[PDB]
Structures are given as C-alpha cells and as structure tokens.
Amino acid sequence: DVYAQEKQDFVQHFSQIVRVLTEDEMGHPEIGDAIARLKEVLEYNAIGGKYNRGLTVVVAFRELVEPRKQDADSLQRAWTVGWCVELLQAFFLVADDIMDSSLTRRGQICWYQKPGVGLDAINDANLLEACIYRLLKLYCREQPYYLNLIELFLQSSYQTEIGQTLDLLTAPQGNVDLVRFTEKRYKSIVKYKTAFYSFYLPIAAAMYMAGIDGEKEHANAKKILLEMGEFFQIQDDYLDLFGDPSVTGKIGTDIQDNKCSWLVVQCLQRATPEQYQILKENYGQKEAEKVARVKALYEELDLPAVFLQYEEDSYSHIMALIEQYAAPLPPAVFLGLARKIYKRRK
Amino acid sequence: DVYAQEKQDFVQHFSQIVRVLTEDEMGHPEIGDAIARLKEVLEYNAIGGKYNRGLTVVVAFRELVEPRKQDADSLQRAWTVGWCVELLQAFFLVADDIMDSSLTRRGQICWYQKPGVGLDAINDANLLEACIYRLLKLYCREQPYYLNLIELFLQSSYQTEIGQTLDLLTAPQGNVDLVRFTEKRYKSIVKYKTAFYSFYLPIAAAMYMAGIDGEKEHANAKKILLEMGEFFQIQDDYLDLFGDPSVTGKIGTDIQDNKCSWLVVQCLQRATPEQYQILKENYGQKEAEKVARVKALYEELDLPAVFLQYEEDSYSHIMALIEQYAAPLPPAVFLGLARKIYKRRK
C-alpha cells in the first residue's frame, strides 16, 4: 500500500510545518500569544485523521514527477502542499462541526465543544485556512505553478462552500420537508461539498506541481475523481448511522440535523405510504427515540445491503472511468486512491 | 468631500457586482439555490454601511493614476477592487457579530440573529470571502498586479485574524482579568485586528493597481495608515458605549464581552483602588445593572473628555506623519481619509 509507505515521512513533516508557522513570531513578539493559540488549534485539529487527502498529493507527485527531479526541495514542497490540503480539511471540519452540532471528531470532543473555546472556534477555523496561503508563499512562491495552486485552493474552497450552502438549504431545522430529498439534489450537493476538495484538489495540486496544467488533462482527471468523491460521501453518510464510532472517530447527526443523506434518499425511493409517514414524523428531530425509529425503518428496508450493492457497482463504475480517462497519467495514481477508499469503514 | 463625490457611482456598481456573481449559475443550474442564497447574504450584509473602506480604493486610484489611463475598464476594475474590500468587511462582520454576541449591525438585526439563519451564517460569512477572489480573477487576472492583490488580500486577512485571536484571548468569558488590559496589549490588538485591513489594505490595493509596488513606498504609507487605524479602533471602542445607536447602527457589547477596549484601559490608568474593585466586580458580565455601573464609573472618570483630548492629539500626530511620509504620493490621498474619519460619530 503506497499510502502506508509514504505516511510516516508525511506525518513526520508536521512538526516542521508547525515550526515554520509558529516562527512568524521572531520579528513580532507582540503576536506571541496568538501564535501559541494557532499552535494549539493546529495540534488539536490537523492531527489524528487518516491523512488521506494530504497523502494523495505526495503519492501522486512521486508518481507524476521523474525521480531525477524529486530533489530534497521538491519533496519538501510536495509534503507542504499535502499539509495545505490537510489544513483546508481542518478548517472545514472545525466549522462544520459547529454547524452540524456535532459532539466528537477524530476520536475526541469537537474543538468548539471544549470549555473555553465555543464560538471562538470560528476564528480558529479561519486561521487554519490562512495558514494554507502562508505555506504556499513560504515554500512555493518562486515556482512556475505558484499561481495555479493558489487559484486551485481558492476555487476549491468556493465550490466546497457552494456545496455546503446546498447542504444547509436542503436541511432546514424544525421543518420536515422530505420532498426535497431526491437523488438529483443529493448528487449536486455532494459533488460540490465533498468531491472537488477531497478528490480533485489533491491530485490536481500534484499535477500542477509536475507541470501538468493542460485543460484536457485536468478535465479527464476530474471525471474520475468527482465520481470517486460522490462515492466517498455516500459512504460517509452510511457510516454516519451504521459505522462504529470507535472506527469513524465521530458520532452521527444526519437524522437529527434533517440532512439530505444518501440513506434518506434511498429510504424514500423504497418506502410505502405508511413508512413515509413514519419517516415524516421522526426525521430531523433531536429525540433519541425518534432517531432510533428512523434507523429501524432503514434496517427494515435493508439499506445496509443496498449500500453494499451500491459500493460494488460504484467501484466497477469508477474502475471503468479509470480505464477511459487515466491516460496519459499512470493508472496507479487513481488506483491507489480507489483502493484506499473502497471497503473503507472509517 | 471627494468621498461624497465618488460614492454614488460606487454604490451603483453594486448591482453589477451582484449580477456577475449570481451568473456562476448560467453553466450550472444545479447550484441555482446556493446562488440565490449568496445574493440574499450579499444584499443583507454588504449594503448599508458607509462604504468608506471600499471607497478609499476608488478615491486613491483616481488620485494615483494619470487621468489619461483611467479608461472605462480601469475604472470598473477600481470599483470592483473597492467592492472586494467591502466584501472582506462583510465576511468579518458577519462572523464577528456571532463571536461577540451582538444584536444589531448597520441599523438592523445581525444576520445570524435572524430566525432560520443562526450558525449557518458561518458558511455565509465564508462565501463572502470567496467572492473576493472570484471577482479578482474575473476582472483583474490579466493585469500585472493580479498576484500582488491576491497576496495583499490574503496577508491582510491573516493579520486581521491574528488580531482577532489576541482580542479573544485577552477577553475570556466568565473570568475577570483586568491585569491584562494594558496600553501595550491594546495597541497590538488593534494594529492587527483593525488597522491592516481597514486602512493599509485599500490604499495599498490602489497603489498596486497604479503600478506602485516598491517596498519603501508601501512601508511609508503603512506608517501613516496603521496609526490612523489605531485611532479608528479607539473611536470604535468609545462609540461602543457613548455613541448613539441610531447613528452607529449597532449596540455595544464590549463591557458584557469582557473586552480589552480603549475605555477599560483608560479607566484602569485612572482608577483608585476602590474604583478598581468596582470595575472588577462589574466588568465582563451580562447583567444590565453591572454594565450601567461600569459606564457610571467611566463617566465619573471623565473618559469622554479623555477621548476628545485624545482625538485632537491623535489627529495632530497623524497629520505630522502625513507631512513626514506621504511623499512622493499626493498628500490628498491621506488627507481625504483623515477628514473622513476624524470627528466621526458613526
């Protein structure tokens, strides 16, 4: 597994990231306390996941750049850009956990739930985002791809926030509206909210770093990676309810939060009129008893087995897309990522 | 007043901004509902202030670019960059109002206090930020200053968020700690949180658009503008308590929120031991009765008259800095801005 291999070097580079970001202090002691707080935010929220989005940048870069051009500086840049993707993710998750009223993340209390943090985490989240652009300037500003990366991170963040807006608008609190939860709407949500930044962004970053900037090259890659991202989000939705929290490191809130999840969309396609009412009376509410009722309806409709069939069909579909669209990139760039996300239970 | 003059054209350009941003829809109908929400967020939060930060870009640009190079496209770019500063401000204020538990802003309920918005405003705020970078790409990407502006907006946002972090760390909820509220700490807070983005950013943006990129040119400007920004924040703090809300369009929360405001710093320098206790028992708490007691202590110490003296001394100081550092820029670029902010009661 090419990810297990790169992973140690990647995670080891984290101190260097933290050191370089916490040395904006040297010229300005007056910001010392803010920098200390940034370090605490980095250590709590950027560490402890699987590093798969960041690691994808490094794996792809080694696979796309001739080994002779992989000098120490080039590699450092690669690990820094991977860390920029991790930082984006940390930004997103800190904010999303507030928005979704989540309890835990990566095996611990959500940052905003800590006594003394609360909605100060909005600022913390946005500091994480800032760090991306400081790292890109500090490590890449003289490279011919610098602007390309900046634009890519900014565009990916815009798209992601557009997705997040569709997510919140499709899920109004205190209102039951099942009629909105369609397959078509679901696919749009997840494409925007998850698939651009989790799949297109890291591979595209590595492409640009390898000098692969062609519009066609990027569009072909994107066809593969947006579909892989739809599957990843569907798996995330399944794991919200049916995943084991000691594996996933987080507690599910989709049913309470009235979310357009793949599960509710699937349920709706299959429910009888009686069951539609059951869903209607119980969905989108805080009461544990009502959440359990929704889960029992999902289990009655064999939605786990529906998920397992879908995962198998999606995996084939994605592999067909790799066959169509990988060239002239090595298929391994996509295959290692597919392997990483399929059968994933965390 | 050169601002009153430019203001109408500036504000008129707002529809065009909204139209160009709400036409990301044409190629992608699936994002239509998100775009509609973006429009509502823009119309609620970017309109209704004084436009002084955005307008500074336009005024300075007309003052720094030879009239012969001020073609229709150049002007459109100038008004768009001004609008980018307004959008940054709107991002900041939407988030800050959540963080500070504010009630009103620009003469209406804060966006997050609207039923149905709540903490979804975190996403709304960040969409406003995204729009900056889309506008810079859509209007300026072929200009030789494009990267300079991008970096300037990103750096200004980082600095601003560093300031905001010092603001929250100096103001812990449920803890009384007056010992932290020193002049030295106050000056650092406000330099970072307010002075970079409210004063340096717009003038610097116009400088770059005029081809003025020299390091020295920017550092001289910055000496003037960071000091003007310290004064503006001190005035903001004074107006938090002593301003008329129908003029300021917002209700003050500094005392409730345990803030390192200029007022509390001034109070502390002047309080007797008895009065220190009064402040200690009453500051940083939600009770109206305790807030009134703090205000009565401030009035007993003649802190309004202290503010009026300070405004006079600061105005002279700033004018001395314009005399030292304006050249070779026209002094009018700084003078119109000073005029705009001194004696300001809103």
Ligand SMILES: CC(C)Oc1ccc(-c2cncc(NC(P(=O)(O)O)P(=O)(O)O)c2)cc1
């Ligand atoms: C400005 C900030 C709010 O923008 C964001 C935009 C998107 C996201 C985001 C995108 N994809 C997935 C997540 N989290 C997942 P999760 O299961 O919480 O990890 P989701 O809530 O189920 O969608 C968050 C987080 C933040």
Ligand SMILES: CC(C)Oc1ccc(-c2cncc(NC(P(=O)(O)O)P(=O)(O)O)c2)cc1
């Ligand atoms: C990511 C986001 C939270 O970052 C921010 C960073 C800074 C600010 C900010 C900077 N200067 C002034 C304000 N608002 C003023 P206000 O009187 O609320 O308009 P302050 O709360 O008294 O400081 C907000 C707002 C948002």
Ligand SMILES: [Mg+2]
């Ligand atoms: Mg979530």
Ligand SMILES: [Mg+2]
């Ligand atoms: Mg969410």
Ligand SMILES: [Mg+2]
């Ligand atoms: Mg989820």
Ligand SMILES: [Mg+2]
């Ligand atoms: Mg405030």
Ligand SMILES: [Mg+2]
């Ligand atoms: Mg504030």
Ligand SMILES: [Mg+2]
């Ligand atoms: Mg204030």
